[model samples]
Target chain A: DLVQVERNGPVTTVIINRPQARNAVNGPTAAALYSAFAEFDRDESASVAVLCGNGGTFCAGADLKAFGTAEANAVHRTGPGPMGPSRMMLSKPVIAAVSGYAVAGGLELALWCDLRVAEQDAVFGVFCRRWGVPLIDGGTVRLPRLIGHSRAMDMILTGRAVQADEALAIGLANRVVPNGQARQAAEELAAQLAALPQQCLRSDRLSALQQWGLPESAALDLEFASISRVAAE
Target chain B: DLVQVERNGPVTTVIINRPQARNAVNGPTAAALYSAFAEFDRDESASVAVLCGNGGTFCAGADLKAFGTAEANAVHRTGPGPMGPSRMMLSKPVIAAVSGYAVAGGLELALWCDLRVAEQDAVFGVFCRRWGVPLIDGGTVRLPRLIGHSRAMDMILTGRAVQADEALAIGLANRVVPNGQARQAAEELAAQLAALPQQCLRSDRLSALQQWGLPESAALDLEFASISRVAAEALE
Candidate 1:
């Protein structure tokens, strides 16, 4: 299986099972990833999702080898994103369990998550920059919002490697665990989130996510609505 | 003068000269700040502006003692910001030379600038959070845009002090200098920016500033226009 889903109470862990290829998403793997996430969202039993990779590496990026073949990663805007789940703005939150190299489109996948728990030895970069690949999978839009324009521009222009420590300092990684413990840490965090007062948490999360790029008065209106809903409940 | 303007080449320095009250801006002082920036913007020779405070302090914020007086800081939907130039999106850039405390509305002032140069011991906080004084001067909008939502929420909620080193780490202070050198460093940096190709730099800066909250395709369209203009001038 290119993508596999495991359930733990209200927490769901989705693993990229293509360890031999560093979990790079070809067309088939991308479809499986999209399906797994969609399924997780549809499940009434699941409250949180953790995205992880098998073997030591998270994902190398899109399979450059499969570019022109029948199994090439899809580029059109019809459904699931080019890197599979990169474009899904789910109602519930997803956490990224990152270890080893999460670069190029892989970095975009990690950025798509609400939070990232990275192993101490993990590395991130815009590796596709050298290959002339533009960040069409929401990297350009999200990176600047996540880490400020100064640092985001530095990473986008230079394609330099950012280790877990630097990532945490810059707010790119929410938490940094010891080497080889990213998946476990992320799962524990998912369970904590699942155990919280979900109505309030979800409402607040939605307000924060949707308030970006809006005028202050307009954003406040959205936040006020969320607060009112939670208060009524 | 409660406010003073110093012109050095293409760089203009606007000082909050009322250090007796740690440069806390009342209504009159706020008006002066607004006028200073407006004049700087109108000047054809000025390419960059530096905002600094006299004495060792930047600003403590709006003068709370003057709240009900006739000279109280203005609060309305019209005209200049309560902290002055906070609402002005200038054609040129402003660099903040921060020292001592830039708390409450003072922090909002620093956040208004295109860049901040802080002294090593400089401090910043949303001090107004404790006084039930909400951020009306673009703090809620710009803070998250500057340093991301997570960290910005922490500062807004906690009202804790953020010193220069942490400010630098978080991309709040673009540059941190030694004690008493913030003004000088900021002026020199402004001079450097002023020396660059003005048209291209200003255009790119505007694109970056306005691209916030815009869709990727729409933002790309704006960026492409900038590149096309620069490329046309690159040859002949």
Candidate 2:
């Protein structure tokens, strides 16, 4: 299997199991990765999810070696992203427990997650810039909102390697732990989040994500709509 | 005069002249501020603009003393913002030359600008949190877009004073120069931008600003509209 899912109480950990390709995802793996998360979202026993790689590196992005083979990326606007899980706005929060490199589409996968927990030596970049691949996923949209327009421009334009310290400083990494502890730390955080009152948390999270495309007044009204039922719970 | 407008070549500088109130903006000054920027946008000679205050303090926010008085803030959604010019999306980019304090509505004014040039000792905050003032002047929208949600939430909720260094680190301040040099430095930067190719620059900026409420693919499509000509330049 290209993807593996493990459950521990309310927190589920999804692993990209292609370490030989540096966990580089092919079409099959992309589908598997996307499918794993969909199942996680559906499973009532699961509350929060963690995405990480099996190898030392998180992901090296698309499996360029598989381009001409049977497992090329699925390029489409609808359905799953060229990356498996990038398009889905899952109800629960997923944390990217990043170790080593997270670049190109790998970076997009991490950006898709609500929070990122990076290892001390982990690196992030728009590694696809040299390849001229537009941030087909949510990179252009989320990176700027995750950091800011000025800083996001620097990363998108330059594709420079951003170290863990810089990532934490810029709000790209919510937390940075010791090397080899990204997945553990992220799951710990996820479990803590699972312990919190899920109703209000999910509503607030959804509102923040949805507020991007609305005017302030209209967005506030939408926010209240989401909170109206959850606030009392 | 409660407000001052000065022209330095292609760069127009707008100053809040109420140093006594730490540049607190009242209803009349807000109108002048809006009018000044409107004129700057329409002026053919002006290619860039800078917003600053006359006193050491940038702005103390809406004039509390003027509230409920004749010169009080105008609370309306359709017209100009209560702080004036906050709602206007000017054609030319405005750089905020911030010194001392930019808090409450003052911070919103700074956020409205495309770039901020803060002095080393400058302080920023949501000072209105104490007064339970809502961020009506696009603060709620712009702050998260400018500095990300987590940090922006901290400022919005706690209303703590953020120093100049921290602001620059978080992408809030594009440039942090020495005290007393913000206006000069920002104007110099503006002059530099003015010399650049305005068409491409303006299009790129507009795209970035407009991309906020768009999906990634749609935003990319919108992005290429502005740069379709430049596609020839990079086709190699």
Candidate 3:
């Protein structure tokens, strides 16, 4: 199996298991990831989810060797992203537990998460830049929104390696732990979040996400609606 | 004069000069600010613009004392922002030289700029939250775009003060200088940007700004169009 799922009470942990390829997502793996996250979203018992990879590395992005092959990732405007689960804004928060390299589409997956817990040895970049592969999985959009356009532009244009410390400083990494501790830290954080008031937390999170392209008056209206829904709940 | 404009070669510095109320802008000041920026945009010689304030403070936001009075700030969707210049997307870049108290609509003014240089003593907040005055001046929209939704939401919900160091760390302020040095630092940075190839730089900036609300493929198309236009014009 290219993916593994484990549940501990209300916190579910999904692991990309293809350590030989540094957990790179082929089409099969992407589908597996999407399904895993989907199952977790529908599972009413699960309140938060943590995504990480096995071995010392997190992921090296989409499997370059699989390009133009039968195993090429499912790419389309709608539905699952090239690396899967990148398009879905789940009802629950997902935390990325990152070690080794989270570059290219791998970085995009991390950005999709609500928070990232990075290991000290972690590296982040748009490594696919030199390969002429455009960031088809929300990198251009999410990167700027996550870290501001100035730094995001520098990273996109240069494709430079951003180390763990720099990642935390720039708000890319919510927390940084020693090597081999990213998963533990993220899982702990996930469990902590699971203990919070789920209704209010999710409503606030959804409101913030939905307000991106909306005008002020409209966004406030949406936020007010979210509050009302939570009150009704 | 409530507002002052000074030109130095290719750089124009627009100053909000109401030091008595800590440079708080009223209706007249907002009009002056809008006109100053409009004129700067039209000037062929001015390559870059810097926005700052007189005295120790940058701006304290709209003049609360003038609220509900004849001097109240103009608040409408179609025209200039309540803080002025917040609605204009200039052909050229503007650098905010921020000192003490850029809060409420004043903070919106800073966020409107492409870059910000803040002094160590500078403070930023959505202080209008306390007064039940919603950020009608692009704060809710631009703040998330500038520093990500996580931190932006915290600032919006709490309306707490963020100092210069924290601001720079979170990508709110582009550069941090010693107290009383924001104007100088911003000007220096502006000059550097002005020295770059204007066509290429502006095209890239426009693409980045326009990419918002667009999907990946559509944004790439927009970027391609910008590059094509820049190539055609710059080669001429």
Candidate 4:
């Protein structure tokens, strides 16, 4: 299997299990990853999700080796992203536990998460740029909003590897721990979020996610309504 | 005088000049800032703008003392923001030279700029969170866009003070100079921008700003159109 799921209390852990191929997500793997997240979202017991890889290395993006075969990664205008779960805005928050290389579509997966916990030596970049593939997995939209346009443009145009320290400084990585601690740190953080007042926290998080593209006054109005709903609860 | 302007070659420096009030923007000051920026935008020779304050501090938001007075800050549904120039999207770039306090509406003005250069001791916050005043300007929109929502939400909800070093680290401040050097550094940055090929730089800048809220394909089309316009300028 290319994907596996484990649960510890309210935190659901989804692991990418194709480390032999650097966890590169093929079409089957992408569909499996998407199904795992969908299952996590549907589960009433799961309050938060943690995404990580099985081996020391995280994903290297869509498996180029599988490109010409029937196992090629899926690309569509709607529904699941080619990188899987990259376009889905889940009801619950998801954190990325990143180690080793998280490049190309793998980088997009990290950006899709609410937060990222990377190991000291973890590297991030749009590696697909070298192969002439455009970022259709919400990378262009989310990267600028995550770390501002100046830094995002640099990464997009140059395809440079941003190390853990630089990622932390630029708000790309929420937390950077010692080597081999990314999974533990992400799970701990997910547990903390799960322990918060669920309704209010979820409402606030959803408000922040939904506010993109809305006018200032309209976004504030929507935020106030969410606040009221939480208060009513 | 509430506003003052100085021109150095292709760069225009606009100063909020009310040190006694810590450069707090009342209605008159807001109008002055709007006019100053409007003038700068119309001047063909001015290729970049620098917004700073007289004295040691940036604007301390709208003057609270002027509330309910004849000189109260304006709060119209559109046009100039209460603190001035927050809603204006100019063709040329503006760099905020920040020193001391930049909180509440003051911080919104800085966020409105393309880049910010801050002094070592500078402080930024959403101080209005304590006063029950909302971010009528683009603060709520721009803050999360500049920095991630996780950090932006923390500041928005808690109203905590972010020091200069943290500000720089978080992408809130583009450059952090030693104390008292914000204006000089920002002016130098403005000069560099002014020296660039104006058409290409402005087109690229406009695309970045306009891409927000647009779909990827639409935004790419817009960007391609901008590039074409710039290419036409090069051919001419």
Task: Please give, for residues A142-215, the per-residue lDDT of candidate 3 as tens digits.
Answer: 78868787577556644668999999988889899999999999999999999999999999998887776567
Error in Å for residue A101 of model 4? 16
Off by over 4 Å in 3: A231-233, B1-144, B147-208, B211-236
On DockQ, the stronger of 1 and 4 is: 1
Off by over 4 Å in 2: A227-233, B1-144, B148-167, B173-209, B215-236
The residue-by-residue lDDT of candidate 4 on B40-60, one tens digit each, is: 988999999999999999978
Worst 10 residues of 1 chain B by lDDT: B227-236
Per-candidate iRMS values, in order, are: 9.0, 7.1, 8.9, 9.7
lDDT of 1 by residue, B77-120 (tens): 98999988989989887888999999999999988887888999
Model 2 lDDT, residue A89, Cα: 82
- Model 1 TM-score relative to the real fold: 0.59
Question: Which digits, one per residue and each the tens of the lDDT, describe model 2 over residues A163-203?
Answer: 99989988899999999999999999999999998988888
**Could you give the DockQ of candidate 2?**
0.11
Cα lDDT of model 4 by residue, A127-229, tens digit? 7766555565666777886778646755654466999999997789999999999999999999999999898888888888777767789889988888688
TM-score of each: 0.59, 0.61, 0.60, 0.58
**Poorest lDDT segment (10 consecutive residues) of candidate 4 chain B:** B227-236
The Cα RMSD across the true interface for model 3 is: 8.9
